Amino acid sequence: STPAAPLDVKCLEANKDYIIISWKQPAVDGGSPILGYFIDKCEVGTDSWSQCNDTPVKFARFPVTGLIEGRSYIFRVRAVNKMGIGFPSRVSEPVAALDPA
């Protein structure tokens, strides 16, 4: 009854101050509408996950902030419906918090 995991977590843009991520809605919503999404981050050296947003976001392209310039991060997304929070997506590829070019 909680939703399935979001799919295909990806990075659209990175710089040292924010990283934009997207994903795709889960194919299964648990029989209730997806109310939104939690995006978690984990520094590549670690196993410690932090929640990037306090309240779910409806949309599928989140700017992650609270980054340390030069550290690299992997991300996951959890979907929420009225029943609660589903299991996290597969983790993303690593992204460095560096300005491009």
Author numbering: 508 to 608
Source paper text:
Myomesin is a 185 kDa modular protein that localizes exclusively at the M-band, where anti-parallel dimers cross link myosin filaments. In addition to a mechanical role, myomesin is also needed for the integration of obscurin and its smaller obscurin-like-1 homolog at the M-band (Fukuzawa et al., 2008).
The ability of OL3:My4L to transition from the solution conformation to that observed crystallographically suggests that the LH helix might have a degree of flexibility. Overall, SAXS and crystallographic analyses support a model in which interdomain freedom allows the transition from a relatively compact solution conformation to an open one that can be stabilized by homodimerization.
